[PDB]
Amino acid sequence: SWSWESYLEEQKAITAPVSLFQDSQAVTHNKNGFKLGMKLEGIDPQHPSMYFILTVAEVCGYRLRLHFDGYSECHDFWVNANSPDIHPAGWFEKTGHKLQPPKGYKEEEFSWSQYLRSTRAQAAPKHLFVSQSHSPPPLGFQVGMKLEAVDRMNPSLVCVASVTDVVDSRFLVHFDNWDDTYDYWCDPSSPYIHPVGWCQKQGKPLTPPQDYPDPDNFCWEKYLEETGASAVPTWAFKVRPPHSFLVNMKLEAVDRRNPALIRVASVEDVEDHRIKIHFDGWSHGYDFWIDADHPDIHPAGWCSKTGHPLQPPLG
Ligand SMILES: CNCCCC[C@H](N)C(=O)O
Numbered sequence: 591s592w593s594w595e596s597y598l599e600e601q602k603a604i605t606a607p608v609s610l611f612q613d614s615q616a617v618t619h620n621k622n623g624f625k626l627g628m629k630l631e632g633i634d635p636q637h638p639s640m641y642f643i644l645t646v647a648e649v650c651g652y653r654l655r656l657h658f659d660g661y662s663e664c665h666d667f668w669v670n671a672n673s674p675d676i677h678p679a680g681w682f683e684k685t686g687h688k689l690q691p692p693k694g695y696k697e698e699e700f701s702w703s704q705y706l707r708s709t710r711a712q713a714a715p716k717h718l719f720v721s722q723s724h725s726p727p728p729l730g731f732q733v734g735m736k737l738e739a740v741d742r743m744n745p746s747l748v749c750v751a752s753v754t755d756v757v758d759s760r761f762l763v764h765f766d767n768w769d770d771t772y773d774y775w776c777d778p779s780s781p782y783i784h785p786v787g788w789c790q791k792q793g794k795p796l797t798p799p800q801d802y803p804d805p806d807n808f809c810w811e812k813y814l815e816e817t818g819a820s821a822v823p824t825w826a827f828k829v830r831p832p833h834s835f836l837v838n839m840k841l842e843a844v845d846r847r848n849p850a851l852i853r854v855a856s857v858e859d860v861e862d863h864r865i866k867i868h869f870d871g872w873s874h875g876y877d878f879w880i881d882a883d884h885p886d887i888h889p890a891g892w893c894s895k896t897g898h899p900l901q902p903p904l905g
Pocket residue numbers: 741744747749765768772
């Protein structure tokens with residue numbers, strides 16, 4: 591079999607130490623208890639504020655492929671078994687969230703008991719989920735508070751934002767007057783969020799809510815008065831320290847073109863909070879920037895220890 595050890599010798603290279611990764615990205619001793627066919631609840635990666643009924647369509651190592659019941663397979667997506675974005679059947683009900691029903695169902699025609707009987711399926715057991723809303727909420731962040739946030743799809747924009755959901759230790763950042771397509775989950779240390787008035791103290795422009803009247807003259811105090819909303823308090827923002835990944839360090843990363851695959855990778859370039867991934871043996875055209883805390887990058891040896899195939903360098 592291909593060997594990391596042999597590869598490092600051949601390339602005179604080094605791996606990114608485990609210490610540079612979050613424990614969740616590095617942990618390999620947890621068993622993946624998810625099984626083909628089990629059903630559960632989870633957010634739609636395309637619409638992060640929404641919850642759907644999902645079925646385990648494939649299991650591979652410490653990862654699983656999820657399918658949106660009743661919908662096209664083209665919507666399928668992969669997550670790690672320790673994902674905080676999935677929850678046990680019944681979770682939405684116990685936490686006050688809304689659940690979009692499977693294609694073909696009206697929301698009232700939905701009850702997990704009838705559904706499971708009609709599909710002769712089993713709901714994934716509760717003990718397999720890291721997120722069940724039993725842990726503490728993020729400090730200082732409550733649904734309804736306002737803040738300023740970088741649009742990660744348009745990073746040159748720091749917009750007026752709100753906290754619209756809180757699950758365990760994370761919260762959902764929402765861009766005022768847009769749908770949820772630009773929303774993202776994060777924690778108090780995210781380098782993409784700032785307290786109200788940040789843009790002003792920085793001399794950077796602030797982007798007001800979509801179609802806000804007379805945008806050129808947006809005033810936070812006025813908007814907060816209009817909405818009766820309060821600003822996330824400044825003490826709540828505890829941005830994380832820049833990561834310590836150095837160029838040329840090697841690691842393992844999920845392929846962004848074909849998520850089923852994980853390949854041998856190297857750090858091509860770095861920023862304070864992101865690293866540019868290069869897939870050994872492939873064109874640099876495939877190189878991509880990714881946040882250092884992304885769940886899809888892991889230390890060398892992750893695939894082997896978890897039982898997931900690792901694609902060696904092209905050629
Ligand atoms: C939260 N920011 C959203 C920015 C969307 C930008 C896009 N060009 C548009 O105007 O549709």
